[PDB]
Write a protein that binds this ligand. Structure first.
Ligand code: MG
Ligand code: MG
Ligand code: MG
Ligand code: MG
Ligand code: MG
Ligand code: MG
Ligand code: MG
Lengths: 315, 79, 195, 85, 101, 132, 517, 88, 49
RNA sequence: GGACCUGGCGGUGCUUCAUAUCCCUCUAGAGGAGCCUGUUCUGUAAUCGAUAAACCCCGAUCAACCUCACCACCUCUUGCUCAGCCUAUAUACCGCCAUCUUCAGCAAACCCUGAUGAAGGCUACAAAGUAAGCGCAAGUACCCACGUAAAGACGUUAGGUCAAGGUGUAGCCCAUGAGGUGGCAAGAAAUGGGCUACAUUUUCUACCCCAGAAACGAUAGCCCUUAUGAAACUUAAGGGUCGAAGGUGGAUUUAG
């Protein structure tokens, strides 16, 4: 089955040559990302699952790894702990307890001679390819924690850094809108917003009296209901700029509370440009600078609607 | 999509102006109003050929002069 | 009884041009391709299926026939039927000053040898009204006469015609309707004083 | 009403009933049994029920370097192949 | 070989309705008029009730072309909900997929 | 218990192809449509005719060629194209196959009044994807 | 016209033959099942009506009419029904669609009915006499052609080229050493056309040309003169008269191919341009031109027929299968044994691979040309192509290819020669054999493979023939220098046991291998 | 070829209808079938009749088997005849 | 016109060009049904025998 | 008859949970009145099958005439399609599915233990279980990762559908096959589900909710007109007459 791997790698190579030929490029420059672009355009599959695609890659991702033979012709195992079956995991455990034992030896003989994250079990059986369970993995992790606590040298720092990974960003800080200048446009910014099938684009104007215009016409004439008026006063009550903004706005789709919440979100995203950053940090953890995901869900058949069952009699 | 299916080369005015098929009919009254209605009905029908429209026209003429008993009982003269 | 023939995959060399190989839109016989691409939802300890027996490659069309250099070859052989959009007629205001009347057409396609389409016979006529010699009572009469067929905002009279199944026939009909409307716009009738 | 004529294994799954409810509780005497035999072993392509001769299906094409003609056998040759079946 | 008579009689009604189209068209043109007074409409009624049966498209029953079922039919593809589901679950009719929403 | 035209694995003893091993809740996900035509898009006329043509075509092409289809047909469809590409067993003579390809060309092209070119992709056996 | 897929491709021209006849016989029984039920393909769903979609009709719809019934029973046993309804319904036969139509239908009885209509119905006997002389060429009648030309001259009309051309052709058929009779016939026809005031035809030119060129071995001169007489009309000569010209130039032009070049130049004026087709044989002239240029090594006419083959006008390819086979074989043998290795590789890509596989002498020319350029690596694929093509010449092709691998020694880079020897060995013993067995033994001896040499010896030693004496001494050396005298003992005992003359020297080699080794 | 088009996508339509799952009686369980219809237009500007036949041919000789086509030309004309200064 | 389809397949089976497995199976079961001893009555035999 | 194994069961023990859930809790409804649509039954010459969870605006996204498988009467026997059947068997089946299932198991091949018995194979500081495949999970569409949809293995009820369609078993086939008019669908009596209401947060005129006035709801039945149909006896819409009883429903529950 290794000979099949050789044939597949040379077929991938000569197909790379013929893709460079039909695409008119050099076989020395026609690379993997361009290979993906070309084959992705050349065979338009209409499927949603990306594993059901026309795939031509590095064939060692396409083929599973055929395992190394542990014995020669004389039949002796090459690895010392082969006869436990789990040779690689137990070998690694033996080496790690050796590193911990010589580290304890170094601490006793030091008194005598004086962001990142762990792997998962799936990532470990990706690395050391050999199947495990969960309690042995957890025991290995707890051994690593007892490694990481002692006065461990930089070689042992690299050695534990083999099984460390890199976490994502916990970077969710809000986004400032830039102050824009459109034909003597001072104290101006914009944003957008959306809640409950409703799009709204509000403008902030820091030079005006305390009222709101919407599509030119006044927000008292736009809102006869006091709940919506509290909804619009909410951010401006939070930044104490009740009289500093005569503002024009736009909204489209939906009813009273929908357009009110959408305009509130647009004003909240817009007002970051003329405040301190701690203002919108506090506003964000007051709950302002986010989309409310509550869109009403579809009805499911066989029911009254979307949650309620029919009056199923028991008898 | 008009290839071969061509309504036999008729002009637009052979569809619109159908006054050329309405000879033996009166001028001002109820039945000429009925004939204007069926003429303007066949005017706005593009699912029929002009030959078929004149075929329905002659059927109306043949029928309306066929039963002249009640049409002369109708206290108004049909031509 | 039984025979054994290898494909042309080993036979065709490296530098054979693809218009000679894949001219036209293929149902993809995998004898001719030298490209080893697999498609399929693969099994867990296995492979996606290769191109042999690949019905998923048969239902999905390849774009191998449209070789971009062969696209270029067919374009440069198609240089001959061309004309030129004349350079006075590029900015669209000047195109309206030279041609302010637009006639639309309709054509579609269908799966199957039957060709007819019922919605392919309307030719909507679109005239911008500010190019005409319409006087004041005349323009007022044309507005009163058409009614709602004329867009008041950007001054575009739009007249639809589907009373007959031919495009040229309805086009001559809309031209006749404009012709008798611009007959009628001048003429002040007897009751127009009784306004 | 005509287009429900189906494949062969579907006919045998319909009439055989060897995935039905009678197998599991031993719901019959086992002496009542109907086996399954093959219907598609012995009809070659271009086996017409009339005596039809083919240079592409029945008989091989180049008769020592010449084509044969489209023909059809007689009646008693059809009787011979019926008695053979 | 056809076996059945409900399906065959619906095809009978379809073809004899296709014949008797323009005559009933002219009679109902005589019917629905506030002009053209009453007795002409009444002899038109005599005529159209005197027409033979299986001659009006009232009788038309849009049954299936694969199993002849009167009910549970799509008029988009002129067959039953069973056989359309049969060939849809096999995967031949294009565009129709099972809805995952 | 929903049972479609899917495979219900009894033992590891049933050779099954790629097509039969996917249930119709995978069609937009992991499969492909056997025929493809614009008759199901809107707007478009002539739909039920396209369906009866496909059903009669597939049942005819199977019941004519005895066991000479490893899988079902592929009826791609483009106007005046009824393009056949099927997968046949490497059992019989190619002389007889060309006889039958011309036979289906003539009969279909004169019955449904349309240019048809056949294509075949021969397979040595039943194509297998799973022992399911 | 065939598929591209690997299982159904042809590998011989017989395979393509049976493929195409399978296609057309399916088409014929398809049109037979269509006309046996004409009421089944009439429901039309396609709009723009491709006209080949309705069946054809052999029925008469008119009976009480006479001329319409005769035309609708003949031109639409059916000829017998038209003739019987014409004889009993007072329906006069015409001078068109009846004489040659019932002559192709049915040919002494057609002449009998035509003569009864000529003595029974007052038609203008000029065109009827022309069609009667043309039918008399195929009903084997000459004095009727003389009476037809006389009745055409006296029938108050000018004669056609059909009657006089049929007379010239069927009279110069059995021309017993006639060398001036054709010139007298051409001159009398020239006076006849000057009395007829119209140009002479291409039909009479080709007919008199073929009938004069088959009369003597070197009588292509008057045939080429008839080709030039057609060429002096305003239209060009046909390629059929030029084909007869090149054919009579190729038989009697044995010591000099200049007259073959002259008739080839007649064809090059006749078909050496865009094909304006009027010839009955527009392929024989170009095929014979390529055969002359390939049998005389003239690289101008081969290029002429090759450029005229399929690029400019592809009428010059093939009427038969034999036309394509002969043209490809001649040009490929000339390009292989005359040109270098690049053109021979082009021949292997573009005539043997463009048509089907090679012939037996074509494979021998390919093997000799490859032995000139030292290419014995793809001998086995062409050998399988020849054995799939030929049922008798596989044994004569495999050994004649493998002699150069059987006589060249073991190089380190010559393993493909031994593999060709092994594949030809299996294919030549396995298909359906003294020289083949001995050649396989000598080839595997020249291979350099120990098990293969021993297996060829153990196979050939029971083929009722021992090896040759050079092979015997090489085997004795490979035994005695193996410290094992068994094969030397076998060679000596078998060349004494197969009644071969290598007895004393071979037994001395065996005793030297046993005792002196 | 110098045709100067843009690319633009109209919003989708999803036809969703519903059938009975069982055959005799289980009403509360149904089987929905989707029907997704996508939309992809082009605006072809400033070409003559012959050139429109060129590019329309180069589409409709390469038209796939799953997509549709709707052709709507906006043709030109200067003036009707009896419209200059007419009395009928 | 479905009757054309039915009679078309009927002749193609009768000419042996189509292999109609459903009718082969139906004549097999009819063959067994006449082979047992319970076949169709004749025109004129029935309840009145 | 003595002993034992597996499963079921216990108004069987201990412990821990149930997130629309078992209760105490929270909201809105049914059962009380009118009508519509299904079930049993009566009359008639008058359909077929489901009828406990898992059946009831069922099969039906359509029984005034075809839809008529129900019958009376008048007829036909290549009868009509090389026959056909809607004749009895879902207790011969294919095919489609309902509940368990809003799960986590099912499981080919070995090995071991029970003195080599049916059977069992669980202790991570690990005393014999390993393991290919299905499923869950992983994955796909909708607004993403949430959630919804979709899938949901093997078995359970001889579960339902031989009147989606074919089919074995038995029966008719000068009929149980087939062509025509008529009526079968109206209520003795209960009965599941749905709509309307039973008021003052209510009703009406305009306004889409800065007003004013009045301190409710309509079936059926009656007369007329309109829509389609060859035909209004019920189907759909509009005008008018009176408009019944309901004055917020109890054991019992339904859904979130
Ligand atoms: Mg609700
Ligand atoms: Mg389910
Ligand atoms: Mg019955
Ligand atoms: Mg049952
Ligand atoms: Mg899952
Ligand atoms: Mg599910
Ligand atoms: Mg039941």
């Amino acid at each position: 089955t290794e000979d099949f791997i050789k044939k597949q790698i040379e077929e991938f190579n000569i197909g790379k040559r013929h893709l460079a030929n039909m695409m008119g490029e050099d076989p020395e420059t026609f690379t993997q990302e361009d290979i993906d672009r070309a084959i992705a355009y050349l065979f338009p599959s209409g499927l949603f699952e990306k594993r059901a695609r026309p795939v031509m890659k590095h064939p060692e991702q396409i083929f599973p790894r055929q395992r190394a033979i542990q014995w020669g012709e004389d039949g002796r195992p090459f690895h010392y702990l082969f006869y436990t079956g789990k040779q690689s995991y137990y070998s690694l455990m033996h080496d790690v307890y050796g590193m911990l034992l010589n580290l304890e030896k170094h601490q006793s003989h030091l008194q005598a001679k004086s962001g990142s994250r762990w792997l998962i079990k799936e990532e470990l059986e990706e690395m050391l390819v050999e199947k495990l369970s969960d309690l042995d993995y957890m025991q290995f992790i707890r051994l690593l924690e007892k490694l990481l606590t002692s006065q461990c040298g930089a070689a042992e720092e690299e050695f534990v850094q083999r099984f460390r990974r890199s976490v994502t960003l916990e970077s969710k800080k809000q986004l400032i809108e830039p102050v824009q200048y459109d034909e003597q446009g001072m104290a101006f910014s914009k944003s957008e917003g959306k809640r409950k099938t409703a799009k709204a684009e509000a403008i902030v104007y820091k030079h005006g009296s305390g009222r709101i215009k919407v599509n030119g016409i006044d927000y008292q004439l736009y809102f006869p209901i006091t709940q919506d008026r509290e909804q619009l006063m909410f951010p401006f009550h939070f930044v104490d700029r009740l009289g500093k903004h005569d503002v024009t706005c736009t909204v489209s789709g939906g009813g009273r509370s929908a357009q009110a919440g959408a305009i509130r979100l647009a004003m909240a995203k817009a007002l970051c440009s003329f405040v301190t950053e701690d203002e919108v940090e506090w506003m964000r953890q007051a709950g302002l600078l986010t989309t409310d995901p509550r869109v009403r869900e579809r009805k499911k058949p066989g029911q009254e609607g979307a949650r309620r069952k029919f009056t199923w009699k028991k008898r | 999509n008009e290839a071969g299916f061509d309504d036999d080369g008729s002009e637009f005015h052979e569809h619109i102006f159908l006054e050329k098929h309405l000879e033996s009919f009166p001028k001002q009254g109820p039945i000429r109003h009925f004939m204007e209605l069926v003429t303007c009905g066949l005017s706005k029908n593009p699912y029929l050929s002009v030959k078929q429209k004149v075929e329905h026209i002659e059927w109306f003429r043949n029928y309306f002069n066929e039963k002249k008993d009640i049409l002369k009982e109708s206290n108004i003269q049909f031509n | 009884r039984r025979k054994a023939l290898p494909p042309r995959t080993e036979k065709m060399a490296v530098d054979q041009d693809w218009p000679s190989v894949y001219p036209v839109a293929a149902p993809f016989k995998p004898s001719a391709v030298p490209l080893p691409v697999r498609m399929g939802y693969p099994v867990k300890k296995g492979v996606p299926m290769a191109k042999e027996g690949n019905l998923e490659l048969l239902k999905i069309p390849n774009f191998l026939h449209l070789t971009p250099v062969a696209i270029k070859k067919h374009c440069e052989a198609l240089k001959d039927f061309c004309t030129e959009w004349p350079a006075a007629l590029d900015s669209d205001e000047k195109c309206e000053k030279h041609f302010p009347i637009e006639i639309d057409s309709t054509d579609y396609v269908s799966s199957g040898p039957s060709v007819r389409n019922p919605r392919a016979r309307v030719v909507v006529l679109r005239v911008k009204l500010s190019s005409l010699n319409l006087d004041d009572h005349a323009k007022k009469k044309l507005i009163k006469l058409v009614g709602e067929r004329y867009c008041k905002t950007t001054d575009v009279l739009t007249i639809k015609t589907d009373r007959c199944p031919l495009r040229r026939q309805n086009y001559d009909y809309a031209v006749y309707l404009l012709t008798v409307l611009y007959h009628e716009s001048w003429n002040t009738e007897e009751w127009e004083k009784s306004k | 009403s005509f287009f429900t004529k189906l494949t062969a294994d579907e006919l045998w799954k319909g009439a055989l009933a060897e995935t039905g409810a009678g197998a599991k509780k031993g719901r019959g005497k086992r002496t009542k049994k109907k086996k399954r035999k093959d219907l598609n072993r012995g009809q070659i392509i271009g086996e017409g029920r009339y005596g039809f001769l083919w240079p592409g299906l029945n008989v091989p094409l180049m008769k020592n370097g010449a084509v044969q003609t489209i023909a059809q056998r007689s009646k008693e040759e059809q009787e011979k192949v019926e008695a053979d079946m | 070989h056809y076996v059945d008579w409900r399906m065959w009689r619906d095809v009978k009604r379809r073809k004899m309705a296709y014949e008797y189209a323009d005559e009933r068209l002219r009679i109902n043109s005589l019917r629905k008029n506030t002009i053209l007074p009453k007795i002409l409409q009444d002899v038109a009624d005599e005529e159209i009730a005197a027409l033979p049966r299986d001659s009006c498209p009232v009788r038309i029953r849009n049954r299936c072309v694969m199993t002849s079922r009167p009910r549970g039919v799509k008029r988009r593809w002129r067959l039953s909900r069973i056989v359309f589901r049969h060939l849809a679950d096999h995967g031949q009719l294009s565009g129709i997929q099972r809805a995952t929403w | 218990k929903n049972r479609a035209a899917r495979v219900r694995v009894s033992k590891g003893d049933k050779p099954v192809t790629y097509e039969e091993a996917h249930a119709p809740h995978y069609i937009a996900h992991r499969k492909g449509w056997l025929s493809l035509h614009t008759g199901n898009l809107d707007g478009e006329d002539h739909a039920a005719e396209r369906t009866v043509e496909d059903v009669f075509l597939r049942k005819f092409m199977w019941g004519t060629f005895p066991g000479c289809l490893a899988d079902q047909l592929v009826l791609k469809r483009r106007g005046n194209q009824l393009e056949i590409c099927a997968v046949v067993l490497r059992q019989l003579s190619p002389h007889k196959y060309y006889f039958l390809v011309g036979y289906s060309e003539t009969l279909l092209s004169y019955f449904y009044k349309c240019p048809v070119r056949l294509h075949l992709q021969t397979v040595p056996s039943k194509v297998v994807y799973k022992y399911l | 016209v065939f598929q591209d897929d690997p299982y159904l491709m042809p590998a011989s021209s017989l395979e393509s033959r049976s493929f195409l006849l399978a296609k057309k016989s399916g088409e014929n029984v398809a049109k037979f099942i269509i006309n046996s039920y004409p009421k089944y393909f009439q429901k039309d769903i396609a709009e723009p009506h491709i006209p080949c979609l309705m069946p054809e009709y052999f029925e008469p719809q008119i009976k009480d009419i006479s001329e319409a019934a005769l035309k609708e029973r003949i031109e639409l046993e059916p000829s017998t029904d038209y003739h019987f309804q014409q004889t009993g319904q007072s329906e006069a036969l015409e001078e068109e669609n009846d004489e040659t139509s019932r002559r192709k239908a049915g040919t002494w009885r057609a002449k009998n009915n035509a003569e009864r209509i000529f003595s029974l119905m007052p038609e203008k006997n000029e065109h009827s006499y022309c069609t009667m002389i043309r039918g008399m060429v195929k009903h084997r009648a000459y004095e009727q052609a003389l009476n037809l030309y006389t009745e055409l001259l006296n029938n108050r009309l000018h004669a056609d080229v059909y009657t006089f051309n049929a007379l010239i052709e069927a009279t110069v058929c059995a021309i017993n050493e006639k060398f001036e009779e054709k010139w007298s016939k051409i001159l009398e026809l020239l006076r006849h056309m000057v009395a007829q005031k119209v140009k002479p035809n291409l039909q009479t030119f080709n007919t008199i040309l073929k009938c004069l060129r088959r009369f003597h071995v070197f009588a292509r001169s008057p045939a080429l003169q008839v080709l030039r007489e057609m060429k002096a009309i305003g239209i060009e000569p046909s390629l059929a008269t030029y084909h007869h010209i090149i054919r009579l130039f190729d038989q009697p032009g044995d010591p000099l191919k200049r007259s073959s070049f002259i008739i080839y130049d007649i064809m090059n004026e006749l078909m050496g341009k865009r094909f304006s087709p009027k010839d009955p044989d527009d392929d024989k002239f170009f095929q014979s031109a390529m055969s002359i240029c390939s049998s005389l090594r003239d690289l101008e006419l081969a290029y002429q027929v090759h450029g005229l083959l399929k690029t400019g006008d592809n009428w010059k390819f093939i009427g038969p299968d034999q036309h394509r086979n002969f043209y490809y074989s001649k040009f490929f043998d000339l390009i292989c044994l005359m040109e270098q290795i690049d053109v021979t590789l082009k021949w292997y890509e573009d005539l043997i691979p463009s048509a089907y596989f090679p012939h037996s002498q074509t494979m021998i020319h390919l093997l000799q040309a490859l032995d000139v350029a030292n290419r014995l690596e793809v001998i086995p694929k062409i050998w399988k192509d020849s054995k799939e093509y030929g049922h008798t010449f596989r044994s004569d092709l495999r050994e004649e290819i493998l002699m150069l691998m059987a006589r060249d020694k073991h190089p380190p880079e010559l393993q493909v020669a031994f593999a060709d020897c092994a594949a030809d060995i299996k294919s030549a013993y396995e298909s359906q054999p003294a020289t083949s067995l001995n050649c396989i033994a000598i080839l595997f001896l020249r291979a350099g493979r120990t098990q293969e040499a021993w297996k060829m010896l153990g196979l050939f030693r029971k083929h009722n023939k021992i090896p040759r004496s050079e092979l015997l001494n090489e085997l004795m050396d490979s035994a005695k220098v193996s410290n094992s005298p068994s094969q030397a003992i076998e060679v000596v005992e078998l060349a004494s046991a197969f009644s071969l003359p290598i007895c004393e020297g071979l037994t001395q080699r065996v005793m030297s291998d046993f005792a002196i080794n | 070829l110098g045709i100067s088009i843009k690319v633009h996508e109209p919003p989708r339509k999803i036809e969703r209808f519903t059938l009975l799952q069982s055959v005799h009686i289980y009403k509360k369980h149904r089987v929905q079938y989707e029907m997704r219809t996508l939309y992809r237009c082009l605006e072809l500007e400033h070409l003559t009749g012959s050139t429109a036949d060129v590019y329309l041919e180069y589409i409709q000789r390469n038209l796939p088997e799953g997509v549709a086509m709707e052709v709507t030309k906006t043709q030109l004309e200067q003036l009707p005849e009896h419209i200059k200064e007419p009395i009928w | 016109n479905h009757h054309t389809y039915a009679e078309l397949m009927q002749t193609l089976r009768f000419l042996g060009l189509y292999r109609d497995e459903h009718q082969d199976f139906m004549d097999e079961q009819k063959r067994l049904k006449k082979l047992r001893g319970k076949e169709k009555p004749k025109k004129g035999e029935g309840k009145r025998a």
